[PDB]
Amino acid sequence: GPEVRFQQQLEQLNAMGFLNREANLQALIATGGDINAAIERLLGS
Amino acid sequence: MQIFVKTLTGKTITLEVEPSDTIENVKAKIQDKEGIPPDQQRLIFAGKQLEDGRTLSDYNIQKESTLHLVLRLRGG
């Protein structure tokens, strides 16, 4: 399934210093796997 | 001196800089070379925001150093 997109995007976020898989998962699930609308949530929204 | 700007990561580019130059002028160099307004940009030093600190000398940013650049499209 497309879960591989979400998983690899948690690592693109890991490189920036977002060192948590669960917060990164919820930030992408809140969009459907759009990462730029996920990054602003990890910044605090 | 010269640093590895990671633009969302994947794209890593060298940027030539002076330590005493302003982070305002670094935002302007990004803006005018890559065609993107500074409001869309955020500079991420290992999860910390670069803001209110003034220059690369103020933070003691140096050489061959891996500053992340987050950029925000207004949807699509």
DSSP state of A18: -
Query: Which of B9, B42, B71 lies closest to A43 in CB terms?
Result: B42
Neighbours of A24 (CB within 10 A): 24
- B72 to chain A, minimum CA–CA distance in Å? 6
Which burial class, exposed, middle or buried, applies to B16 when counting CB atoms under 10 A from its CB (0-12, 13-18, 19+)?
Answer: exposed
Nearest to B27 by CA among B10, B12, B42: B42
**Enclosing domain of residue A43:** 1-45
Interface mutation vs chain B, best among A19, A39, A42, most B CBs within 10 Å:
A39
Neighbours of A27 (CB within 10 A): 24
Q: Give φ, ψ of B71 to 5 degrees.
A: -130, 145
B-chain residue closest to A34, CA distance? B75
A-chain residue closest to B43, CA distance? A16
Torsion of CA A35, B6, B24, B17, to 10 degrees: -170
Domain count, chain A: 1
Domains of chain B as residue ranges with CATH? 2-72 (3.10.20.90)
